[PDB]
RNA sequence: AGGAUAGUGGCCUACCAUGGUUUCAACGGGUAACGGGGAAUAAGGGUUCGAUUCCGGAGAGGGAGCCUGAGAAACGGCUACCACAUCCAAGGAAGGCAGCAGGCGCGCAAAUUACCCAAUCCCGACACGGGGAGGUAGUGACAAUAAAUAACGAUACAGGGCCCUUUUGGGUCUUGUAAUUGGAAUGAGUACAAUGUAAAUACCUUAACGAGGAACAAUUGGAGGGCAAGUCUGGUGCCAGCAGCCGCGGUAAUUCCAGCUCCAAAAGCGUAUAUUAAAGUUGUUGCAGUUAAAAAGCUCGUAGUUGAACCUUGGGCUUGGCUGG
């Protein structure tokens, strides 16, 4: 038959289901970033847990090792590219010091609210889900869309949105048309 | 298993064709021909995946049935014909001549050549022996049989094929200092000069090859193809990159400067 | 409003099939999309070719609308186009009539029914008729 | 072990439990909104009593 | 020297000794002996269908005092007879003689649970309808 | 030595020797055993699995024997027997779904008797024919990805936050409450249409329609401990039942049956079974053996395992590549 198509899981659950310290930390963290459920926090922790594992393996190698230099710099460059890592902390020791709030800062939901286009973070998600926000000339309706540094300046209302110069929406047309 | 296989699973195709996983269940099974199945390039892959002249397998058959494609100066209509190393492909409608030479990345490069260079080819001598009525002959890497060769020609030498009469113009003796491209193994596509030939009776002889950057690698004698009488003097035009292998860090640096 | 904009990229001249082939980018703001028939008319005017020598297919609209990407062919003549085209595209363009045949079940059942007859059908049915003296 | 017994009392308590209908109460928010409701209730308007914090205080 | 060989060429003694001594692990014995395949009423399956033979009722163990309401079921796959508990308040009234019931374990993986003596299975479905659905009046028994 | 084979060969025959394997486990038995690439889990070391997208092998109900052919001991080829089993005018004849779909049976356990060669490729005398190979759709909560179920105001009212200020009385800006009040936004759905396709469906785009209880209404398990969340209300009263384990139930039950409230995960949640970590409870890393389980009654002893030290060191000379600076 045809070749299999690869797929993989993008999250992992905690070993202890009930722990007040972790439950309170997650809910406090979900409320700050307007997340739908706990799985969106597990997803960040999962990809950060494997970033650390990659960093540990390179750190055991000698400095100036060809693999450590190539993949370590590439991983740092990618993290700097998405704005998670600062430009003055490209040492692979600050990579281990990264925290989940660094990643939630770079979501589309966080940037829409932090750019003043929305009143609150929960307004940001519904704006995104309702096809109002466009990055560049492309409409993006994924709240977890990770904004790159060069894409940061191009977040604005969609050109065909009611809030960004488009026509009036369904509700207004029904009222003013009577 | 009661007989010869006639299909090729997509996953089982040679990796240097660079076929995608999900385009279908099967891959083009190269026909019997001058080149081995694993070391060939079917014309369907060349006309559709490489040149992208044809959009699908139906179109490559339409191209070849109008007599456009010539391999080594003869019109070929077999869509899965196993073209191989040093083969010449002529499309006089587009006025293009190609030679199948490996690039340094291990794949068959799209190497355009002039019409003057497309009038001959090189073949590695596999064996020299006597035929019926005591007539000596040479077998090249593409299955060619040339009678009455120069009596100095021996195995592992390279001959220059007139490619229109099939005769030998001249040859290169296998010896230290000859220019070589590697046609097998993980050093496939690299170009260098012979530094030292290490003999092993009953086993496999090993050849030490020095890159233009004075990088040394070892490969089996069966993967050695003599292409020049000395360094910097190849008998055919080399593909872009000149068969010099760069490390991934060097490639990243070169790519950064180019862009 | 309208202002349909057409861009061509990856253009390859293909005298092997007597045609030019390219990727088509269509910019249609304030417009759901552009029909293949309307693209063929526009493409003929832009490149001064016969409308029947232009073939477009495989279009998809990007997310949010306002832009589509496809593939296009322009032949040197209508005769060349009719020779090197799939049947279904010529039926799309009206250059051919959809061939009418029975379903695959009927063709296969008829093929297997004829497999039980050796010789001409006229001989087989005349002999079968003779057996059924009725 | 000795195993036997009258089967006549099966479902005794559930059968005689007085049926009480659920009051038609407002729907709770779903999805992201419910996480928003819980977050404020636990970190914005804290209802603790000098160190005594209860999620479900019985009326007392 | 820790009572086991340490020489670099003593891998055979170490491999055989470990192989010999894993037989003391009862979990290991059941996997290789195939005891679930040979001895278990389910034959190693998670579930098994059967026919209810009779409603009887089992007295609970001390210090508890109650009537655990079970059924006697003859398995279709091998004809063996087992006792299966009928969970929840009054679900015994949903199960009649000569009904087809789907069984599952009690979750203690072959041992009895709680005060119920000698019962290792529970009733999951009757007549192809979930017993839980019957208890919560989501569905009605097809009869 | 011959015969046979495409060919080596006890492959077979004639004659002749007495050899061949084995405690470094032969031989035999079992396998709920096709092998591998690989899968699950994983600090390290490991444990468990691999019928199944690729490769190799084997089979076409069970055996055996063959024809044709380069290639088959082929089974959508034949011959014969066994077991099943079809039509019959009773003389005879014809079978093989572990191919696709479908049916019966088995079961805890698995979908349509659909469309097509347009793509991927294969076969043929072949640019043209064929292909249940293959592709498309149907069923599909196997698993996997992303991700709706609401957002923002207006006032009211409360607190904090400030400021006019001594407090007082205010102005006023941040939260919370509002059967307490609005106007915006959108896709689920549907739909002209275009795109998609061999033709369709669906997706993507997109006119018109499409949200206040926005009934366009999220569920599954729990609330004594482990383990997050009730000593609330009613019912029962060692009964009914719960309870993985410890335990709960004999008249205010923190555990049953319910109502309310709350907790956890959420388009998912629970149960059963297996397996992995936890397990340093299989321990090579890395267990224990006086008394918790466990030194053979004691010596000898073959295989196995394991075995004291010792043989060009030091010095000197030049010497490249690099790494503090
Ligand atoms: Mg809590
Ligand atoms: Mg050949
Ligand atoms: Mg040739
Ligand atoms: Mg016929
Ligand atoms: Mg016929
Ligand atoms: Mg034993
Ligand atoms: Mg025991
Ligand atoms: Mg085990
Ligand atoms: Mg077993
Ligand atoms: Mg007890
Ligand atoms: Mg009995
Ligand atoms: Mg049942
Ligand atoms: Mg012999
Ligand atoms: Mg022989
Ligand atoms: Mg086994
Ligand atoms: Mg088996
Ligand atoms: Mg196995
Ligand atoms: Mg496998
Ligand atoms: Mg396998
Ligand atoms: Mg099996
Ligand atoms: Mg599987
Ligand atoms: Mg296979
Ligand atoms: Mg076979
Ligand atoms: Mg069968
Ligand atoms: Mg077959
Ligand atoms: Mg056979
Ligand atoms: Mg068959
Ligand atoms: Mg037949
Ligand atoms: Mg008769
Ligand atoms: Mg039949
Ligand atoms: Mg079938
Ligand atoms: Mg199933
Ligand atoms: Mg069915
Ligand atoms: Mg086809
Ligand atoms: Mg099929
Ligand atoms: Mg598809
Ligand atoms: Mg799903
Ligand atoms: Mg809903
Ligand atoms: Mg719809
Ligand atoms: Mg629709
Ligand atoms: Mg159409
Ligand atoms: Mg509930
Ligand atoms: Mg608990
Ligand atoms: Mg608690
Ligand atoms: Mg009471
Ligand atoms: Mg416990
Ligand atoms: Mg009371
Ligand atoms: Mg009470
Ligand atoms: Mg309490
Ligand atoms: Mg409890
Ligand atoms: Mg309760
Ligand atoms: Mg939650
Ligand atoms: Mg471990
Ligand atoms: Mg134990
Ligand atoms: Mg222990
Ligand atoms: Mg260790
Ligand atoms: Mg111990
Ligand atoms: Mg101990
Ligand atoms: Mg122990
Ligand atoms: Mg004792
Ligand atoms: Mg003693
Ligand atoms: Mg002894
Ligand atoms: Mg000894
Ligand atoms: Mg020594």
Short mmCIF file of C-alpha atoms (C1' of nucleotides) in Angstrom, two decimals, chain F:
data_model
loop_
_atom_site.label_atom_id
_atom_site.label_comp_id
_atom_site.label_asym_id
_atom_site.label_seq_id
_atom_site.Cartn_x
_atom_site.Cartn_y
_atom_site.Cartn_z
"C1'" A F 1 33.41 -44.79 -8.95
"C1'" G F 2 28.99 -43.85 -11.10
"C1'" G F 3 23.78 -41.90 -11.72
"C1'" A F 4 20.90 -37.64 -11.56
"C1'" U F 5 20.83 -32.25 -11.66
"C1'" A F 6 21.25 -26.12 -14.59
"C1'" G F 7 25.15 -27.01 -11.64
"C1'" U F 8 28.39 -28.31 -6.14
"C1'" G F 9 27.09 -31.89 -2.69
"C1'" G F 10 25.03 -38.79 0.55
"C1'" C F 11 21.26 -35.36 -3.67
"C1'" C F 12 20.80 -40.83 -4.96
"C1'" U F 13 23.20 -45.84 -6.10
"C1'" A F 14 27.31 -49.68 -5.58
"C1'" C F 15 31.45 -50.89 -2.75
"C1'" C F 16 34.08 -49.55 1.62
"C1'" A F 17 35.47 -47.50 6.42
"C1'" U F 18 33.20 -46.00 11.72
"C1'" G F 19 32.53 -42.20 11.93
"C1'" G F 20 29.26 -37.10 13.10
"C1'" U F 21 26.85 -33.74 17.57
"C1'" U F 22 26.91 -32.97 22.86
"C1'" U F 23 27.11 -29.90 30.08
"C1'" C F 24 30.52 -23.98 25.73
"C1'" A F 25 23.51 -27.82 26.77
"C1'" A F 26 23.57 -31.68 21.65
"C1'" C F 27 19.02 -34.46 21.03
"C1'" G F 28 13.98 -33.84 22.58
"C1'" G F 29 9.63 -30.93 24.13
"C1'" G F 30 6.80 -26.13 24.34
"C1'" U F 31 5.77 -21.64 21.90
"C1'" A F 32 -1.45 -18.28 23.17
"C1'" A F 33 6.78 -18.24 17.39
"C1'" C F 34 6.90 -16.28 10.34
"C1'" G F 35 12.23 -13.31 10.73
"C1'" G F 36 13.95 -8.27 10.19
"C1'" G F 37 13.41 -2.84 9.43
"C1'" G F 38 10.82 -1.43 13.74
"C1'" A F 39 6.73 -0.39 18.42
"C1'" A F 40 5.46 0.94 23.83
"C1'" U F 41 7.93 2.69 28.07
"C1'" A F 42 12.08 4.84 29.03
"C1'" A F 43 18.21 9.09 34.03
"C1'" G F 44 21.53 5.30 32.90
"C1'" G F 45 21.40 0.19 32.43
"C1'" G F 46 16.90 -2.24 30.87
"C1'" U F 47 11.62 -4.67 30.30
"C1'" U F 48 7.71 -5.84 26.97
"C1'" C F 49 5.93 -6.15 21.88
"C1'" G F 50 6.51 -6.52 16.27
"C1'" A F 51 -0.35 -10.94 12.37
"C1'" U F 52 -0.20 -5.71 10.07
"C1'" U F 53 1.93 0.24 4.91
"C1'" C F 54 8.99 -1.77 3.38
"C1'" C F 55 12.48 -6.20 2.64
"C1'" G F 56 13.02 -11.65 2.85
"C1'" G F 57 10.19 -16.40 3.59
"C1'" A F 58 5.87 -19.67 3.25
"C1'" G F 59 0.69 -21.00 1.53
"C1'" A F 60 -3.74 -20.84 -1.47
"C1'" G F 61 -9.27 -26.45 2.46
"C1'" G F 62 -5.25 -30.95 3.64
"C1'" G F 63 -1.40 -33.77 1.20
"C1'" A F 64 1.15 -35.63 -3.13
"C1'" G F 65 2.33 -35.57 -8.38
"C1'" C F 66 2.84 -32.88 -12.74
"C1'" C F 67 1.93 -29.92 -17.99
"C1'" U F 68 3.45 -25.48 -20.39
"C1'" G F 69 7.19 -22.19 -20.11
"C1'" A F 70 13.33 -18.70 -19.45
"C1'" G F 71 10.95 -18.87 -14.92
"C1'" A F 72 5.79 -22.61 -11.10
"C1'" A F 73 6.02 -28.40 -8.04
"C1'" A F 74 1.68 -22.33 -9.93
"C1'" C F 75 -3.46 -23.65 -7.52
"C1'" G F 76 -8.41 -16.77 -10.12
"C1'" G F 77 -3.23 -24.20 -14.21
"C1'" C F 78 -3.99 -29.46 -14.45
"C1'" U F 79 -4.01 -34.90 -12.26
"C1'" A F 80 -5.22 -38.19 -8.12
"C1'" C F 81 -6.73 -39.14 -3.04
"C1'" C F 82 -9.02 -37.23 1.86
"C1'" A F 83 -12.75 -33.79 4.14
"C1'" C F 84 -16.62 -30.62 2.73
"C1'" A F 85 -19.84 -29.55 -1.08
"C1'" U F 86 -23.10 -27.99 -6.24
"C1'" C F 87 -26.54 -29.33 -10.67
"C1'" C F 88 -28.91 -33.91 -12.48
"C1'" A F 89 -33.81 -36.00 -16.84
"C1'" A F 90 -30.00 -40.83 -12.00
"C1'" G F 91 -27.05 -41.80 -17.65
"C1'" G F 92 -23.41 -38.03 -15.95
"C1'" A F 93 -21.08 -33.02 -14.90
"C1'" A F 94 -18.74 -29.29 -12.22
"C1'" G F 95 -15.81 -27.10 -7.41
"C1'" G F 96 -11.83 -23.91 -3.88
"C1'" C F 97 -12.65 -15.50 -1.60
"C1'" A F 98 -5.55 -16.51 3.44
"C1'" G F 99 -7.85 -11.34 -4.10
"C1'" C F 100 -12.21 -6.87 -3.96
"C1'" A F 101 -17.08 -6.28 -1.99
"C1'" G F 102 -20.41 -9.29 0.34
"C1'" G F 103 -22.82 -13.75 3.44
"C1'" C F 104 -22.67 -17.65 7.49
"C1'" G F 105 -20.07 -19.12 11.71
"C1'" C F 106 -16.81 -17.70 15.55
"C1'" G F 107 -16.40 -14.57 18.99
"C1'" C F 108 -14.96 -8.92 23.58
"C1'" A F 109 -13.27 -7.80 18.88
"C1'" A F 110 -13.18 -5.16 12.92
"C1'" A F 111 -16.65 -0.98 7.29
"C1'" U F 112 -19.94 -0.60 0.95
"C1'" U F 113 -22.18 -6.93 -2.66
"C1'" A F 114 -20.50 1.63 -4.34
"C1'" C F 115 -17.42 4.96 -8.72
"C1'" C F 116 -12.95 5.07 -11.91
"C1'" C F 117 -8.40 4.03 -14.69
"C1'" A F 118 -8.01 10.92 -14.16
"C1'" A F 119 -3.18 10.17 -10.65
"C1'" U F 120 0.92 5.89 -9.05
"C1'" C F 121 2.60 2.13 -11.66
"C1'" C F 122 2.28 -2.82 -14.16
"C1'" C F 123 1.08 -6.04 -18.44
"C1'" G F 124 0.32 -6.78 -23.95
"C1'" A F 125 1.57 -7.36 -30.81
"C1'" C F 126 0.60 -1.47 -27.96
"C1'" A F 127 1.08 6.51 -28.20
"C1'" C F 128 -4.93 3.67 -28.51
"C1'" G F 129 -6.62 -2.06 -24.76
"C1'" G F 130 -6.76 -4.15 -19.66
"C1'" G F 131 -5.77 -3.66 -14.43
"C1'" G F 132 -11.29 -4.53 -7.07
"C1'" A F 133 -2.90 -3.35 -8.38
"C1'" G F 134 -4.10 1.38 -7.43
"C1'" G F 135 -7.01 5.87 -6.72
"C1'" U F 136 -12.17 8.15 -5.10
"C1'" A F 137 -16.14 8.28 -2.13
"C1'" G F 138 -19.32 5.27 1.98
"C1'" U F 139 -19.08 3.32 7.33
"C1'" G F 140 -15.38 4.89 10.82
"C1'" A F 141 -14.62 8.77 18.64
"C1'" C F 142 -8.35 2.95 16.33
"C1'" A F 143 -4.91 6.52 17.11
"C1'" A F 144 -2.98 11.87 15.80
"C1'" U F 145 -3.24 17.84 14.68
"C1'" A F 146 -5.38 22.38 15.21
"C1'" A F 147 -9.58 24.16 17.66
"C1'" A F 148 -16.04 26.86 18.91
"C1'" U F 149 -19.53 26.46 22.92
"C1'" A F 150 -19.09 33.35 23.69
"C1'" A F 151 -16.87 38.91 23.47
"C1'" C F 152 -17.45 44.11 24.78
"C1'" G F 153 -19.98 48.05 26.64
"C1'" A F 154 -23.76 51.00 29.35
"C1'" U F 155 -25.55 52.03 33.77
"C1'" A F 156 -26.77 50.24 38.66
"C1'" C F 157 -24.18 48.79 43.13
"C1'" A F 158 -19.96 47.26 46.34
"C1'" G F 159 -15.29 47.17 47.73
"C1'" G F 160 -10.53 48.25 47.10
"C1'" G F 161 -7.12 52.44 43.70
"C1'" C F 162 -6.25 57.07 43.99
"C1'" C F 163 -7.01 62.08 44.35
"C1'" C F 164 -10.37 67.30 47.24
"C1'" U F 165 -8.93 66.25 51.61
"C1'" U F 166 -7.75 65.51 58.67
"C1'" U F 167 -11.29 61.55 59.11
"C1'" U F 168 -16.23 63.56 58.16
"C1'" G F 169 -18.33 64.70 52.89
"C1'" G F 170 -16.80 64.14 48.40
"C1'" G F 171 -14.45 63.98 43.42
"C1'" U F 172 -12.68 59.90 40.98
"C1'" C F 173 -10.26 54.95 38.40
"C1'" U F 174 -9.19 49.36 38.93
"C1'" U F 175 -11.63 45.02 40.08
"C1'" G F 176 -16.42 42.01 41.79
"C1'" U F 177 -21.58 41.84 41.82
"C1'" A F 178 -26.24 42.54 38.96
"C1'" A F 179 -34.36 38.37 36.53
"C1'" U F 180 -30.35 44.67 34.82
"C1'" U F 181 -29.63 46.83 29.88
"C1'" G F 182 -27.73 47.50 25.05
"C1'" G F 183 -25.66 47.52 20.45
"C1'" A F 184 -21.67 45.07 17.73
"C1'" A F 185 -18.71 40.08 15.97
"C1'" U F 186 -18.60 35.17 14.07
"C1'" G F 187 -18.95 30.12 12.30
"C1'" A F 188 -21.74 25.23 13.10
"C1'" G F 189 -25.80 24.75 9.45
"C1'" U F 190 -27.43 26.06 4.66
"C1'" A F 191 -27.26 28.08 -0.01
"C1'" C F 192 -26.88 30.40 -4.98
"C1'" A F 193 -22.05 30.11 -7.87
"C1'" A F 194 -16.98 29.23 -8.68
"C1'" U F 195 -13.05 26.14 -7.34
"C1'" G F 196 -12.22 21.13 -6.48
"C1'" U F 197 -12.92 15.97 -9.53
"C1'" A F 198 -12.58 11.13 -14.63
"C1'" A F 199 -17.59 12.55 -12.66
"C1'" A F 200 -19.00 13.80 -8.02
"C1'" U F 201 -18.82 14.50 -2.21
"C1'" A F 202 -16.22 17.19 1.07
"C1'" C F 203 -12.48 20.99 1.98
"C1'" C F 204 -10.82 26.39 0.71
"C1'" U F 205 -13.39 30.79 -1.22
"C1'" U F 206 -18.06 33.47 -1.40
"C1'" A F 207 -23.79 36.55 -2.81
"C1'" A F 208 -28.74 35.88 0.32
"C1'" C F 209 -29.91 33.40 4.94
"C1'" G F 210 -28.05 31.74 9.68
"C1'" A F 211 -27.31 33.76 18.08
"C1'" G F 212 -30.09 36.15 24.21
"C1'" G F 213 -32.40 31.48 28.10
"C1'" A F 214 -27.49 33.35 22.12
"C1'" A F 215 -33.08 25.66 23.95
"C1'" C F 216 -27.00 26.63 18.53
"C1'" A F 217 -28.31 24.53 26.42
"C1'" A F 218 -20.66 19.49 27.51
"C1'" U F 219 -19.94 15.60 29.06
"C1'" U F 220 -17.58 11.87 31.94
"C1'" G F 221 -16.06 10.68 36.79
"C1'" G F 222 -15.70 12.06 41.77
"C1'" A F 223 -16.26 15.39 46.83
"C1'" G F 224 -13.43 10.56 54.41
"C1'" G F 225 -8.01 9.30 53.21
"C1'" G F 226 -4.61 7.92 49.19
"C1'" C F 227 -6.53 12.40 46.03
"C1'" A F 228 -8.61 18.28 44.40
"C1'" A F 229 -13.33 19.02 46.11
"C1'" G F 230 -19.23 19.15 51.85
"C1'" U F 231 -19.31 17.02 58.67
"C1'" C F 232 -24.90 20.82 53.65
"C1'" U F 233 -30.61 19.10 52.97
"C1'" G F 234 -34.02 14.84 52.38
"C1'" G F 235 -34.48 9.31 52.24
"C1'" U F 236 -32.75 4.22 54.24
"C1'" G F 237 -31.24 2.17 58.86
"C1'" C F 238 -25.41 -3.88 59.04
"C1'" C F 239 -31.16 -3.40 54.67
"C1'" A F 240 -30.44 -1.43 50.08
"C1'" G F 241 -26.03 -0.47 48.48
"C1'" C F 242 -20.86 1.72 48.23
"C1'" A F 243 -15.92 0.45 48.59
"C1'" G F 244 -9.05 -0.74 43.27
"C1'" C F 245 -6.97 -0.54 49.15
"C1'" C F 246 -7.91 1.40 54.15
"C1'" G F 247 -12.98 1.30 55.08
"C1'" C F 248 -18.79 3.39 55.02
"C1'" G F 249 -24.12 1.80 56.32
"C1'" G F 250 -27.59 -0.14 63.54
"C1'" U F 251 -32.36 7.25 62.96
"C1'" A F 252 -28.16 14.87 62.29
"C1'" A F 253 -24.27 8.67 57.12
"C1'" U F 254 -18.24 13.92 55.31
"C1'" U F 255 -18.52 7.18 51.91
"C1'" C F 256 -25.29 4.39 50.12
"C1'" C F 257 -29.93 6.57 47.07
"C1'" A F 258 -31.06 11.73 45.70
"C1'" G F 259 -31.31 17.54 45.57
"C1'" C F 260 -27.93 21.61 46.08
"C1'" U F 261 -22.98 23.07 46.00
"C1'" C F 262 -18.00 22.03 44.82
"C1'" C F 263 -13.49 19.39 42.49
"C1'" A F 264 -10.72 17.06 38.04
"C1'" A F 265 -10.20 16.34 32.86
"C1'" A F 266 -13.11 18.09 28.52
"C1'" A F 267 -14.97 16.76 22.81
"C1'" G F 268 -13.78 13.89 25.51
"C1'" C F 269 -14.27 11.06 30.20
"C1'" G F 270 -14.79 6.20 32.70
"C1'" U F 271 -14.40 0.61 33.05
"C1'" A F 272 -11.98 -4.51 31.89
"C1'" U F 273 -7.54 -6.96 30.31
"C1'" A F 274 -2.28 -6.92 28.84
"C1'" U F 275 2.28 -4.34 29.16
"C1'" U F 276 6.03 -0.45 30.64
"C1'" A F 277 7.80 3.09 34.55
"C1'" A F 278 7.17 3.44 39.55
"C1'" A F 279 10.47 -2.11 40.80
"C1'" G F 280 17.23 -1.17 43.93
"C1'" U F 281 9.99 -6.34 44.45
"C1'" U F 282 15.01 -9.99 39.19
"C1'" G F 283 19.39 -5.97 41.27
"C1'" U F 284 25.66 -6.17 35.35
"C1'" U F 285 25.07 -1.04 36.78
"C1'" G F 286 21.89 -2.50 41.51
"C1'" C F 287 18.73 -6.63 45.95
"C1'" A F 288 18.71 -10.09 50.11
"C1'" G F 289 20.45 -14.92 52.85
"C1'" U F 290 22.08 -14.80 62.28
"C1'" U F 291 16.70 -13.66 63.89
"C1'" A F 292 11.73 -11.10 58.38
"C1'" A F 293 12.20 -15.90 52.54
"C1'" A F 294 16.90 -17.83 51.87
"C1'" A F 295 24.63 -21.05 53.38
"C1'" A F 296 23.96 -27.77 50.61
"C1'" G F 297 25.53 -31.89 57.43
"C1'" C F 298 30.81 -32.05 56.10
"C1'" U F 299 35.19 -32.68 53.01
"C1'" C F 300 37.00 -34.14 48.05
"C1'" G F 301 36.20 -32.99 43.08
"C1'" U F 302 35.41 -32.64 36.70
"C1'" A F 303 33.45 -29.07 33.60
"C1'" G F 304 32.74 -23.51 34.39
"C1'" U F 305 34.55 -18.98 36.50
"C1'" U F 306 38.98 -16.69 38.42
"C1'" G F 307 44.24 -16.65 39.08
"C1'" A F 308 51.32 -13.07 42.78
"C1'" A F 309 55.39 -10.18 40.71
"C1'" C F 310 59.08 -9.46 36.64
"C1'" C F 311 61.67 -8.05 30.25
"C1'" U F 312 63.07 0.07 27.00
"C1'" U F 313 62.75 3.04 31.89
"C1'" G F 314 64.88 7.48 31.89
"C1'" G F 315 67.77 11.40 29.77
"C1'" G F 316 69.19 14.55 25.65
"C1'" C F 317 68.46 16.81 20.86
"C1'" U F 318 65.60 19.06 17.07
"C1'" U F 319 60.77 19.27 16.10
"C1'" G F 320 55.16 20.77 13.67
"C1'" G F 321 50.16 21.86 14.65
"C1'" C F 322 47.78 24.65 17.90
"C1'" U F 323 45.61 26.57 22.38
"C1'" G F 324 46.82 32.11 27.75
"C1'" G F 325 48.32 36.49 26.30
#
